[PDB]
Design a protein around this ligand. Sequence first.
Ligand SMILES: *C(=O)[C@@H](NC(=O)[C@H](N)c1ccccc1)[C@H]1NC(C(=O)O)=C(C)CS1
Ligand SMILES: *C(=O)[C@@H](NC(=O)[C@H](N)c1ccccc1)[C@H]1NC(C(=O)O)=C(C)CS1
Lengths: 697, 697
Amino acid sequence: WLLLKLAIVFAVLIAIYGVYLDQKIRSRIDGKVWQLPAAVYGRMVNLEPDMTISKNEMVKLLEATQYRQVSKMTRPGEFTVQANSIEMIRRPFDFPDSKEGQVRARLTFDGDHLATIVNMENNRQFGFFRLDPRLITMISSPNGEQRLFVPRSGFPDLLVDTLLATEDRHFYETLTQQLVKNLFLSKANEAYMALIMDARYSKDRILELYMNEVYLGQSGDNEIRGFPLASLYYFGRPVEELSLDQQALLVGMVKGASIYNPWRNPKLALERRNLVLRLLQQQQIIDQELYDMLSARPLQPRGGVISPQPAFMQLVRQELQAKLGDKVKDLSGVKIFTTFDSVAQDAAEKAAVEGIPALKKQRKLSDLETAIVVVDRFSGEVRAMVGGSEPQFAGYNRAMQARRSIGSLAKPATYLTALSQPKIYRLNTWIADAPIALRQPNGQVWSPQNDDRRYSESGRVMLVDALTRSMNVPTVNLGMALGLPAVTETWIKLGVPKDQLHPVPAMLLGALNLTPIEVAQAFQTIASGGNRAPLSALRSVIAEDGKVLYQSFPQAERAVPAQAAYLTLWTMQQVVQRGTGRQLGAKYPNLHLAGKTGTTNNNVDTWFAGIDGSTVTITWVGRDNNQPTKLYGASGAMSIYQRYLANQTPTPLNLVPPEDIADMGVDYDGNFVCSGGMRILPVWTSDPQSLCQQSEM
Amino acid sequence: WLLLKLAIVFAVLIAIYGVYLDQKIRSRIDGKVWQLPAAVYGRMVNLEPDMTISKNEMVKLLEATQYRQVSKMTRPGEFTVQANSIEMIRRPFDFPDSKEGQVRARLTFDGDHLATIVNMENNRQFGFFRLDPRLITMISSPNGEQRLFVPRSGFPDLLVDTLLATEDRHFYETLTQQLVKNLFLSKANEAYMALIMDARYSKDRILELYMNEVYLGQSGDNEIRGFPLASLYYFGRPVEELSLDQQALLVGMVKGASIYNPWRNPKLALERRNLVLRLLQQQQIIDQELYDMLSARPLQPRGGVISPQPAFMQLVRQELQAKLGDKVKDLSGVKIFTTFDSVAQDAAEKAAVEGIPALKKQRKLSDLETAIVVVDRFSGEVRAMVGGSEPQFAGYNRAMQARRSIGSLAKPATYLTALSQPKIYRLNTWIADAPIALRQPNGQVWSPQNDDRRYSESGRVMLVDALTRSMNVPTVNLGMALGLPAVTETWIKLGVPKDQLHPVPAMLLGALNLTPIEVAQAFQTIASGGNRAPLSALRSVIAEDGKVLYQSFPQAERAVPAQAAYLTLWTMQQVVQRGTGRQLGAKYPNLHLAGKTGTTNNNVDTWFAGIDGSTVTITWVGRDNNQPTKLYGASGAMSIYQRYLANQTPTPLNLVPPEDIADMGVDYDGNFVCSGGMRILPVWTSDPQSLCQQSEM
Ligand SMILES: *C(=O)[C@@H](NC(=O)[C@H](N)c1ccccc1)[C@H]1NC(C(=O)O)=C(C)CS1
Ligand SMILES: *C(=O)[C@@H](NC(=O)[C@H](N)c1ccccc1)[C@H]1NC(C(=O)O)=C(C)CS1
């Protein structure tokens, strides 16, 4: 017999093929298994005793951070609402500062402020309590396969059993065969690889690799793979927080994700979900005492979840390039922590989605558009970005790309340049309000007019009223007295791009084309108290091994004096209370908002700059075809800001006067009085006996 | 270990695949291996003592039957030439009568006749000696693969060794691998099949199957496979009769027949032939004492050998359908024995190939054509068929397909109808030669004229002279006296198609459109002595197992009386000696040829019917466009027959007078005389005292 002898070498030749496969499995598994895309997270909110936040504001903040309201808590990422407190189970999160687990706390409130945050385990108060950030999106991997790596513990025991019942009973050496099918191949070859895989790597590793590989959905040209990313994609909570009905649907989609897609066909997807529920009940785990309760819950955010936050993600990407260059991207398992505010965004999106079609019908238009930028008053951190009236599905971001004439938003700069000189210009400084005729290099006569084409009876107005009422004629006169290079110098210090400044008399009235983000920088500089803080979207960039690649730091710069900024901010409160913006100040008088309206020529662009206790908000309302809006600054843009304020809880603006601020009294003539006077104006002076020098006449 | 245990079943699964292959090899080999195409052979010539054949005629007959002239005989199919004898080795042939082997005989001659055929082994005379037939062609197999099966002995020992040296040394268990590669497949599968093939079937069978399978050439869309058919295709002798240089070329072509094809590239083919010769010399068989003698012989008939004898093969195919129907063809290894004469054909082809371009230049024409049919005088067996001036490459066969007006070839029929009545018409019967005017159903006057438009001085001519000189006017008068139905009755008896006979006065002059084969039937009937023998191309059809499928038998039928046919034949000798055909009778007076010329109106068609001692030859010369040839009956057609007679050895016509034939004397008045007379004519009379009844006046 030369049958065995010749075919003995067949066992040898296939065994050496197995040693070749073992060498290949180790090359992949003992190291890089996948190119894990960059995880993009929102702001990490730290709660504190005596912090200004209400019970309702906390529910809205919890709900925005993927937390669920329940009557009785069991799972993490859940909360209960009481008459004066909130009980929650803060989900486990690998924070860059320190990795944390499950923390069950009670948040006791006293109306407007947070009294205590007590651990429900030991009954002890917290010095500060960390709220985990919400996962915004994932930056597209070139491979086209999107995942979120989660270890063995991260998957609950119920889900492992839900998967075991529909697929395998591990105790041999199909689960390890399916792994090698998705992980390596395009039947005999996979069964041979599974023999090696099971023998070398322990059971725990097999189900860890499988639960992060399996195909579960599709978004454009990106594969939604593995149970952890699928959980957030289909419902909106981590894999650990799933209910059994949701686990059954995720488990059911494994053998055919495309036909069990609830977005396309819900009937077949619901039918397959009940099939998983009817498979589990047959086994020792479940009884028909709740099968009809799980099968009764029909499922989902019903959106495509393709490009989450396209307006804000443009800036994130642009800043990742500015700080880390070209890689970044080579690295796998990157964690990006942004300045993004889920509360401010939903409110800004709702103000855009509802406000615009309401202004389109009201004014009888066909193509009105908008742009909203929300930044932190002091730090300059970009909290929210709205690129248009349709912020969900966007291709054009009007917050970073739409360069438009700013209009009357250019007025504070002139007054800030004047109020920078306390020895000359004060709030009671009389500005001429009489006809203007300025000959230019043409030589055509430039005769700017006031909005009503009227001039003051006495032929003058005080500085304070000129900005409050957004008067053009006194603005030019003041701006021409300081000189255009001085006013152009203020703008550079405010943070606006240098190449956009054209020093011509028209600049004082709005001949400055900026994007809402560039406008947000100029208003932030004055709102912080004169400190120019460069606007940012990146807080930190962390690697897989917890290595800090990028870490942002406070880099604020003193641009304009503190007292000049305060005097401008105080006058900006007068525009919101009595001036052009008085329609807002009547709706919210207890917010003491500092603001400025903007209306370009022929109602082409409508602008509003709103300053609360915590944020600087730039709202722009206009048409993409540069056509009339039949809208003003107070209407349109400001009515979108009022909607943004009504959609959330705004912080009231309490202006803390800095050094050398003295509230002085003036008479009808505008002269400082020792005691009394019909008007009280703040003055940048260290010795109020500026009245004595004035009263002596 | 579950390595051996799991892979022990791999030896089992491949062994059961081998038992499947053994079952498949037996299904093919133990029975039908190939669909062997029908072998088509020429006439089987039987030599006899006292037979009329010369030494030179025998050399020509041997050379035509693939026999080679040598100075010293060694191999079969060879012959030597002496002063009065021929020594030959008659090759082995499986004759239908009795299978024979190698016979070395001396053929002693006495000028014109064969004296003795003596076996050179025992020095004994033969009663009859069989000459093997030449293989004409093979009838195309639907499979498209042409072969000629030859057993193990059929291949010489030198050729087996010539093949062994270039390929294998059989003693194991590549020769059996090459077999299964060509015989079954489109490397591992063939080596596995070769293990089975070698183990079950003995060595002898392997080389028998291989030597009949191997690809050696191509002809149109037919594969020339195996050494036996390749031998005749490339050289012209059976595989047994090859020289070592020819064996080496055939052996060399095995690994690549297309690039070692001597028809396309002779340089590479000659180079590879010397490569085989230089491989054999290295081994114990050959020494450099003759390598330079074998390598010095450069090779071949240089023709395509695509469609051998297309004109004659049309009839073979047509008759195979008439006698055996649709199968035939299902059967494999069929042997077809035809009436084909290789000597008559080469001579008829040479007369067409040389004669036509010679008549084209001579007469200054551009498209002259021809057709030649040679049949056996008595049996009616078709010996040769020429379809045109280019008989090698033919698409149109003018012998079976070209229907043309016969002209003066219609004259013998009228005289045969007249000479059938001995009581009325004799050779000395006076026929009127005066103007004719026959009113027809138009009513237009038909006035036929003699070729010279002249009439006899006395106003009459004798019957004998009227046919001899091919006179039109006396032919009509004789034909109208017998009546057209009597003359139409003679034609039916002669064997011409019934639907082509139009009984109108014009028929007597050539208003009869026939093909040369149909003309061959009419002239055969009279040349045999009045016996109509249906013309045939098939002698027998034999199966592979020597089973007689078809066997032809003598089926001659008495059509016209013997004496009437003789009197017509004797007058046909007068046309060749003194009449229209006198140009032939001066070149060959000792042949006493019986003939008739034919010239249609406006020299459109030229015809000649030549009768020798053994054959009836119909020659037609005309243009395919029915245009003037500038040629007559005596010139053109008859000049092609003279070339056919000069290219071979014709049998002299010695007319044996049948019963009641008496040579009688006539005076100038044409009356029978008792003794004397200026003319001697044969008369169908049993009592010559027809002179007494005549002389009494
Ligand atoms: C600033 O934008 C300043 N605008 C104008 O002077 C433009 N050219 C204008 C537009 C409509 C009607 C009259 C003049 C204006 N400031 C505002 C404002 O507070 O929004 C408007 C309403 C007019 S003065
Ligand atoms: C028979 O073919 C008979 N032919 C004619 O009468 C034709 N019409 C003819 C052709 C040319 C010149 C005069 C008449 C003739 N038989 C032959 C012959 O023997 O071949 C010819 C030459 C003229 S009579």
